[PDB]
Design a protein around this ligand. Structure first.
Ligand SMILES: NC(=O)c1ccc[n+]([C@@H]2O[C@H](COP(=O)([O-])OP(=O)(O)OC[C@H]3O[C@@H](n4cnc5c(N)ncnc54)[C@H](OP(=O)(O)O)[C@@H]3O)[C@@H](O)[C@H]2O)c1
Ligand SMILES: NC(=O)c1ccc[n+]([C@@H]2O[C@H](COP(=O)([O-])OP(=O)(O)OC[C@H]3O[C@@H](n4cnc5c(N)ncnc54)[C@H](OP(=O)(O)O)[C@@H]3O)[C@@H](O)[C@H]2O)c1
Lengths: 409, 408
């Protein structure tokens, strides 16, 4: 077996938790020896530890520089009842990203045989999603009745306290929230986006809504311009690429009619939403990579961008055949292992991480596919059961195809 | 000429302001006589009136129940320099939607001969965008340096204050903002969405992020469920349709791969962003309806959902040929006139509003179209100037076909 090194692993929930075991059992552990630091981020063990396991996992990623994460449940009211939880725990992803910081870079996994839903996307679209702040570290509450909601800033220095009226509720109640972001975090966000654009050789676009959030989003736009003009403007010219700020609604329209081949710097919320749209446009939520690259340049957290796929977990619980796509969870392992190999100049691990990705593509392009991708080719009404493999047949086929590729080399 | 009635009109900026005139002079007032109350909401007069023109127009819509609005400029810092304005004026749309409230219903305008960019959308997607609150009535500010940002609630009855920590900036500054929403507005939002689904015969989906905004977005989710179970669930089952809540990121993916045929209840921000994504998916940003339906059930504001097309306006300024799609601006008039005809039982005006929309569709499907629609057919690189009409020849042909349809 290859000696892989130290890797922080985080277990998830429902359908992805099951696929996670198959990946470890059929594709990884037979060929790689790892100092696997495992953290159960399943909903029950997060509840049992009062979510401390989530903060422990984040700290381990700081120590060992590589984390691979399975999709997890973020509970609302209906999940508190289903699992008898103590409280509505925050998203484990929000907690992990808030401790590490950085940019979540997402990108579709492309197969030559899979038609897109968007006709023009002949090149990849890479989304750089800011991983900090905004709605994912906000403080929201219900306004019970009439009253004023105000937002106040108290400076650390000589007091110049400022009180802003949010809304005076004259009758009835409602909702209110405050959210924030950090100058330093936005600077890291900008650097990560300019570097990625230059590294790939593609233009870079940043989307905000600064016409409406004039000071909030205007900070994002200004900091990108300043960093561009001071550190990156010349290297952009030398590579024959450009940087441009666009309104977010203009940007989604341009992306929809684009040919692809650009970097898309997104604020936290838009990066969430638009990365599922892009992934689905290219084929399936199961065909997309997601890597949190930290500002240190050395630490990464690879993950599946999709959720736990509970709707498929429901069918599995009623003993109905499931055809869930494991590729995004598999590429979380391979991308994490690839970065682990790059930190240690591990030749054998680099080759294994590439071979494991090559096996996924080669298998799909040969006609062996989960139902989601078979629907891309034939159209959902024209799909028969012969057109695809169930969840377990597909991972059986990847396990066989990987064993053969590794036996050959 | 037809006796149209009282209609509030709001002029806009740049390329849309040019197109707006052409519509009035070629397609409306030659055939309709209207008590037209015109408000110049262009950036020039909004500055001159200190945006009092925008508040005046919104008040006029409340009295006369029908407003038609041209696309306008929302100024950034970079447009304060271009016209040397007093301040960064707020969005006239936000101001108008805030005074009226309600839901902005958006839907693509379909033509037989125009391929989509999204393969599977064979049925219409209608987005119901909540028009009140959230980012569009928010208070944002720059955090200059280290300090504490808190949000407070003081009840009116004099009971105890509650303060929540937003963020303690230990080093450096950043940004912060507060935003809110109102129960009654959410209820009106929910009623309009269940009713529209029942009117169209399609299922209804609401998108929020209640796993993250547990109390803020949970309120939206809970109020829809309560209104569904108590008032609309039984009529839904009788019509073989349904309502379901979905997280926004799952929702945008489902919509992308769907066949269409559903109502999409969106919060203010998502309704903004996603309606331009859907419009571009079907063909072009200029082929989309946008109608603000107020909770009172009588007043309505139709608009062009797109922007002012400044890229074409720059070419227009530099004396270069343009090919801008006027149909969204044309439909704002027809939708406005149609509702005016519904309130006055004006059979003739009802017919005129439909004839004007049919002529637009019939024109494109006969092969006479703007460049954006020609690019949908041939692909933008393979489009020649013989493949399309410019902005002014296209509205010339619409004038001819509309006069012929009305005479016959
Ligand atoms: N990274 C994360 O940890 C993360 C991200 C998002 C959501 N979540 C959590 O996951 C739970 C479910 O959320 P959700 O259902 O809204 O999001 P989701 O699990 O990503 O959505 C599942 C739906 O999207 C499609 N889909 C997603 N992944 C797929 C795959 N690998 N193969 C085939 N189809 C796939 C399926 O649509 P069809 O039903 O049409 O097959 C499925 O029903 C929630 O509790 C949420 O908190 C976690
Ligand atoms: N409803 C409103 O009043 C509204 C909404 C949004 C923005 N705005 C304002 O508009 C100003 C700038 O405009 P924007 O950023 O929104 O740009 P935009 O008008 O969305 O135009 C962006 C691109 O979309 C295409 N496009 C849009 N409308 C079109 C039409 N009717 N026919 C053909 N092509 C069309 C053009 O594509 P090409 O690249 O092919 O030219 C154009 O370059 C902003 O200051 C903002 O305040 C107003």
């Amino acid at each position: 077996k290859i000696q892989g090194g130290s890797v922080v692993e985080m277990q998830g929930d429902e359908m992805t938790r099951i696929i996670w075991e198959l990946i470890k059992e059929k594709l990884i552990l037979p060929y790689v020896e790892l100092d696997l630091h495992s953290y159960d981020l399943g909903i029950e063990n997060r509840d049992a530890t009062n979510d401390q396991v989530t903060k422990d996992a984040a700290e381990a990623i700081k120590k060992y520089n590589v984390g691979v994460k399975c999709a997890t449940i973020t509970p609302d009211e209906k999940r508190v009842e289903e699992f008898k939880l103590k409280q509505m725990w925050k998203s484990p992803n929000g907690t992990i990203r808030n401790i590490l910081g950085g940019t979540v870079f997402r990108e579709a996994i492309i197969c030559k045989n899979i038609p897109r839903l968007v006709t023009g996307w002949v090149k990849p679209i890479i989304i750089g999603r800011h991983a900090y702040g905004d709605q994912y570290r906000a403080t929201d509450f219900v306004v019970p009745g009439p009253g004023k909601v105000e937002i106040t800033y108290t400076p650390k220095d000589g007091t110049q306290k400022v009180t802003y009226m949010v809304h005076d509720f004259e009758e009835g109640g409602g909702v209110a929230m405050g959210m924030y972001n950090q100058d330093k975090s936005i600077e890291d966000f900008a650097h990560s986006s300019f570097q990625m654009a230059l590294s790939k050789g593609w233009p870079l676009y940043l989307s905000t809504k600064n016409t409406i959030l004039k000071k909030y989003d205007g900070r994002f736009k200004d900091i990108f311009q300043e960093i561009y003009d001071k550190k990156y403007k010349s290297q952009f010219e030398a590579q024959k690429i450009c940087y441009e700020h666009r309104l977010i609604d203009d940007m989604v329209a341009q992306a929809m009619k684009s040919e692809g081949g650009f970097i898309w710097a997104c604020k936290n919320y838009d990066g969430d939403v638009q990365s599922d749209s892009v992934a689905q446009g290219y084929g399936s939520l199961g065909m997309m990579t997601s890597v949190l690259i930290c500002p240190d340049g050395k630490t990464v957290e690879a993950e599946a961008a999709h959720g736990t796929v509970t709707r498929h977990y429901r069918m599995y619980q009623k003993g109905q055949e499931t055809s869930t796509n494991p590729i995004a969870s598999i590429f979380a392992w391979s991308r994490g292992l690839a970065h682990r190999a790059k930190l240690d100049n591990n030749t054998e691990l680099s080759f294994f991480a590439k071979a494991l990705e090559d096996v996924c593509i080669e298998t799909i392009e040969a006609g062996f596919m989960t139902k989601d991708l078979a629907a891309c080719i034939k159209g959902l009404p024209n799909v028969q059961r012969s057109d695809y493999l169930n969840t377990f047949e597909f991972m059986d086929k990847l396990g066989e195809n990987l064993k053969a590729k590794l036996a050959q080399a």
